[PDB]
């Protein structure tokens, strides 16, 4: 796993733990511990029901923190079934996180701006809000009270006068709490993340079970021009130690090669001599060595399943 | 060659042959065509008529007449007049023709600027050295008897197909193939060419061949290690470049023409390994003894002798008898071949049919 | 990605719309299965 992959994983973990409930952490951590993970396997790992995994998968899908992949499977001894797999498409999740972080801060900042504006007015009976400008064209002939249009009743001043400080406090808190996301996004922008696919995710798969019914394989149909929406993403070394006897053998081989090369160029026989008169063409020391060795020895003593396959 | 040696961009080159006839539309370009496609007068196709007008309309600046020994012919010389040009060059290894039209080149394209010796370039490593030889295959008794009675035109086929020539060619081919040589067997007579090829199981080329098939044969002969020899004909007599060919044999000939011998020898004068120590290319000439072929053989090598080449007479090929199997070794086959060569001279009614 | 690119935030994705998903009569035939096609060199 590349170092950036850990940064993305940590960003996803922080977002899920801070902005989603408890069961959401379980679902996404399961398919972050593993790569693409079948729905049946996901249910078996967390021991939760379909009616409980539904809301979790649905919300993590709407926010694009999890991607789905449906493919037809043909078990050798069962009816063909359509299996559903869940994985994480990091470019998609990061964009969703970045947009949501920006929007939440922007909404609070705008609320700070709005709450710092004049109050306004409301009618107690019809519960209709009037702005400062709108209320100034309804005041009575005595210039004493603002009268409603539908009810013809005095208006009551609106709230939000005192929140001038609370909204700033809320923004002060959020940026402190949301700090890790901003720090992680900065590091992500520096690097370049590769978009993930079901097949690509399968390369990092940690099998969940011994005998999972789902075949964690991607065998795409042959010559299928059909394109689904959002289903595409952007020697041997041998050594030989040569001994002295091998060296002389190699020299003999080299000499033979030179001799063969010389023959290939030599002229034929008929071109060598003038062939006029010839008929026309047509249809013991070992004992001496031992007695020496004994003699020197005396001296030194004196001094001292059938399928198609290939070969790789 | 033009593309490889200079920086001529492919866009400006147009080849006007029988296959493709598109012409360059860029301001200045190059046309490489042939006399047959440019010297024709009577019948030109619609596709080939626009191209000829394109050639004639523009005022060219240079014309390169390759193999200029054929320009003074009855009709080829017409191109030198029709095509407008301020400079004319002639390129030919041999400047000889049987008739007296050779001198006509003086007022067609101009004088002869430069000439080069053959042996001088041979000793400097620019062209290969060749041990020219002339094998004397004595006509067998059975064939020879018919040669006396038969007329001139059939006598040729008779002394081209004598079995001894088959044996000599088979022995030389095997001997040189073992030496890792690429052999070319020329024959102006097509019937013998096919008979030799089908007997030895080797590819052959002759006039009826589509351009691609002969090109495929040429490429295979160059780079395919299994096909070491081919069987060319009069088409490959001149202007075909085979850097790999080293040995050369000829079984037939176009009478007394001295040029064809030199042009054929040229196929092996450019052998790639023409500088390794002791290398000598080979040029064999199988001729039947006591026949009119010797009259033409001693006459069709009078130009190479002037250049400096010397032909060596080979009466007998040593070790030829011990070869396992020789073509037409039994009299039965010789007799069979002799006779074989001797004999050579209402829409609704549509359903009904 | 376009909306993120208008606010000045680098988008780590692209619009999927930009994913560009990428003679006759022969002469000698006794050489039936010998001629290997050495078309280019
Ligand atoms: Mg040439
Ligand atoms: Zn009201």
Swiss-Prot record, chain A:
Q: Where is the composition biased (Basic and acidic residues)?
A: 251-263
Transmembrane ranges? none
Per UniProt, subcellular location reads as:
Nucleus
- Zinc finger (C4-type) positions are 123-151
InterPro entries this protein is in? TFE, TFIIE/TFIIEa_HTH, TFIIE_asu, TFIIEa/SarR/Rpc3_HTH_dom, Znf_RING/FYVE/PHD
Gene Ontology MF: a single term: RNA polymerase II complex binding
Q: Name one Pfam family in it.
A: TFIIE_alpha
Q: Which UniProt keywords apply?
A: Metal-binding, Nucleus, Transcription, Transcription regulation, Zinc, Zinc-finger
Cell membrane recorded as keyword: no
Gene Ontology cellular-component annotations: mitochondrion; nucleus; transcription factor TFIIE complex; transcription preinitiation complex
- Chain positions covered by the region annotation Disordered: 251-272
Main location per UniProt?
A: nucleus
Q: Write out the GO biological process terms.
A: transcription by RNA polymerase II; transcription initiation at RNA polymerase II promoter; transcription open complex formation at RNA polymerase II promoter
Residue ranges occupied by any HTH TFE/IIEalpha-type domain in the UniProt entry? 8-98
Quaternary structure note: TFIIE is a tetramer of two alpha (TFA1) and two beta (TFA2) subunits.
Q: What else is known?
A: Present with 35900 molecules/cell in log phase SD medium.
Query: Which family, according to the similarity comment?
Result: Belongs to the TFIIE alpha subunit family.
* Described purpose of this protein according to its UniProt entry: Recruits TFIIH to the initiation complex and stimulates the RNA polymerase II C-terminal domain kinase and DNA-dependent ATPase activities of TFIIH. Both TFIIH and TFIIE are required for promoter clearance by RNA polymerase.
Full protein name: Transcription initiation factor IIE subunit alpha
The species is Saccharomyces cerevisiae (strain ATCC 204508 / S288c)
From Swiss-Prot, chain B:
Domain Helicase C-terminal stretches: 167-321
More info: Present with 825 molecules/cell in log phase SD medium.
Q: How does it assemble?
A: Component of the 7-subunit TFIIH core complex composed of XPB/SSL2, XPD/RAD3, SSL1, TFB1, TFB2, TFB4 and TFB5, which is active in NER. The core complex associates with the 3-subunit CTD-kinase module TFIIK composed of CCL1, KIN28 and TFB3 to form the 10-subunit holoenzyme (holo-TFIIH) active in transcription. An additionnal subunit, TFB6, plays a role in the dissociation of the SSL2 helicase from TFIIH after transcription initiation. Interacts directly with TFB6.
What's the name of the protein? General transcription and DNA repair factor IIH helicase/translocase subunit XPB/SSL2
Coding gene? SSL2
User: What highest taxon heads this organism's lineage?
Assistant: Eukaryota
Q: What happens when the gene is disrupted?
A: Essential, it cannot be deleted; epistasis studies suggest it is involved in damaged DNA excision repair.
The record's subcellular locations are:
Nucleus
Q: Where is this motif: DEAH box?
A: 66-69
Q: Where is the signal peptide?
A: none
* Modification type Phosphoserine: residues: 330
Outcome after substituting residue 67 to Q? Loss of DNA translocase function of TFHII
Q: What does this protein do?
A: ATP-dependent DNA translocase. Component of the general transcription and DNA repair factor IIH (TFIIH) core complex. When complexed to CDK-activating kinase (CAK), involved in RNA transcription by RNA polymerase II. May have 3'-5' helicase activity alone, the TFIIH core however has no 3'-5' helicase activity. Also involved in transcription-coupled nucleotide excision repair (NER) of damaged DNA. In NER, TFIIH acts by opening DNA around the lesion to allow the excision of the damaged oligonucleotide and its replacement by a new DNA fragment.
Residues of the whole record sequence present? 423 to 837 of 843
Task: Tell me the protein family, please.
Answer: Belongs to the helicase family. RAD25/XPB subfamily.
Instruction: Give start and end of each Helicase ATP-binding domain.
Output: 1-113
From Swiss-Prot, chain C:
> What more does the record tell us?
Present with 1150 molecules/cell in log phase SD medium.
The UniProt subunit note reads as follows: TFIIE is a tetramer of two alpha (TFA1) and two beta (TFA2) subunits.
Family named by the database record:
Belongs to the TFIIE beta subunit family.
Q: List the disulfide bonds.
A: none
Q: Which organism is it from?
A: Saccharomyces cerevisiae (strain ATCC 204508 / S288c)
Protein purpose: Recruits TFIIH to the initiation complex and stimulates the RNA polymerase II C-terminal domain kinase and DNA-dependent ATPase activities of TFIIH. Both TFIIH and TFIIE are required for promoter clearance by RNA polymerase.
Q: Kindly provide the name given to this protein in its UniProt entry.
A: Transcription initiation factor IIE subunit beta
Residue numbers of the full-length protein present here: 275 to 327 of 328
Q: Which residues form a coiled coil?
A: none
Q: Where in the cell is it found?
A: Nucleus
